[PDB]
C-alpha cells in the first residue's frame, strides 16, 4: 500500500465506529482487549489509601508491556510530558536504572490530577500541574514519554492533535537526540501523520507498537525508540485488526493490576 490506503481504511474504521449503537459500542470497545482488573484499586483510590502498590490508572500496564517487550528502556532521568494521574511516572519510578521522573500535566479542569501514593519510588517523583507541556522549556533527559491524545469522532481533529505531539517530541529531541522516547499517536493512519512519522523514523529510528492494553474504539498507537519496521505497514495491519474485531461479541481478555510494591528508593 502507497499510504492512502492505509488512510481511507482507518477512516473507514472511524466511520463505523461512529454508526455503532452504544449497544455495539460498549461491546466492541473492550472486546478481546487486554483489561486489568481495578475491583481492588478503583477501592483503594475511592477511600483515598495512598499507601499501596497497586496502578494508579491503567497506563502504568500499558507502560509495562511497552517496556518489558522493550521498545523503550527507562534509565536515568524520565520526563513524563502530560502524566494525568501519574501511572507512568509511578511505574518509572518502580524501575531500577531509573534516576529522576519530572511527571508534567494540566490537572486543571476535569483533568486527570497527580494521585499521591506511597508506591515503589515515589520519592524521586516530582509532578507539576498547571502545565502546559507545548510551553514547558526544553530540559535535558534520557527519556521522553508522553501519553496525551484527546479522542475526537473527528479524524482530522484527531490527526491535528497528533501532530502538535509528534513537533513536541522533535523539539524535546533536538537537545536530547539520543535519548529515548515513548510517544502516543492518537492517529496514525491519517496522512499528514504518517509522512512526518516516517520523517521522524528516518531522523530519529523507532517505530510503531500497537498496544494489547488500548481499547478498539481508539487507534492509538506507540511510536517508540527501540521498535522498527515499515510505518504503513504498521499502521495497517492494526486497521486491520480493528475492522475485524467488529464481529468480536466476546468480553475482554481479564488480567490481574499490577502492584508495583508500597516504598522509596
Ligand atoms: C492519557 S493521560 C496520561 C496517562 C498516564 N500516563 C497514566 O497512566 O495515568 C494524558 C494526560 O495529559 C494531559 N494533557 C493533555 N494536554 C496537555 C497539555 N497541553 N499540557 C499538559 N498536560 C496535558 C491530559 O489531561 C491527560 O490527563
Avoid at 4 to 21: F, I
Avoid at 97 to 123: C, F, K, Q
Avoid at 229 to 258: H, Q, S, Y
Wanted: with cysteine; net charge positive; hydrophobic share 35%.
Amino acid at each position: 500500500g502507497p499510504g492512502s490506503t492505509g488512510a481511507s481504511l482507518g477512516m473507514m474504521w472511524k466511520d463505523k465506529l461512529n454508526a455503532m449503537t452504544k449497544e455495539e459500542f460498549t461491546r466492541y470497545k473492550r472486546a478481546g482487549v487486554m483489561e486489568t482488573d481495578r475491583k481492588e484499586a478503583r477501592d483503594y483510590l475511592k477511600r483515598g489509601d495512598g499507601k499501596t502498590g497497586l496502578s494508579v490508572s491503567r497506563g502504568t500496564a500499558k507502560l509495562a508491556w511497552m517496556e518489558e517487550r522493550g521498545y523503550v528502556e527507562l534509565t536515568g532521568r524520565v520526563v513524563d510530558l502530560g502524566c494525568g494521574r501519574g501511572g507512568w511516572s509511578y511505574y518509572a519510578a518502580s524501575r531500577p536504572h531509573v534516576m529522576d521522573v519530572r511527571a508534567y500535566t494540566l490537572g486543571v479542569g476535569g483533568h486527570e490530577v497527580p494521585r499521591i501514593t506511597e508506591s515503589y519510588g515515589w520519592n524521586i517523583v516530582k509532578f507539576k500541574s498547571r502545565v502546559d507541556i507545548h510551553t514547558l522549556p526544553v530540559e535535558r533527559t534520557d527519556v521522553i514519554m508522553c501519553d496525551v491524545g484527546e479522542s475526537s469522532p473527528k479524524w482530522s481533529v484527531e490527526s491535528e492533535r497528533t501532530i502538535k505531539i509528534l513537533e513536541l517530541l522533535e523539539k524535546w529531541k533536538v537537545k536530547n537526540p539520543s535519548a529515548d522516547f515513548v510517544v502516543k499517536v492518537l492517529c496514525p493512519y491519517s496522512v499528514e501523520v504518517m509522512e512526518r512519522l516516517s520523517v521522524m523514523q528516518r531522523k530519529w529510528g523507532g517505530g510503531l507498537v500497537r498496544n494489547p492494553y488500548s481499547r478498539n474504539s481508539t487507534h492509538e498507537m506507540y511510536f517508540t525508540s527501540r521498535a522498527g519496521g515499515n510505518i504503513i505497514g504498521a499502521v495497517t495491519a492494526c486497521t486491520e485488526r480493528l475492522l475485524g474485531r467488529m464481529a468480536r461479541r466476546d468480553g475482554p481478555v481479564v488480567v490481574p493490576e499490577l502492584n508495583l510494591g508500597t516504598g522509596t528508593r
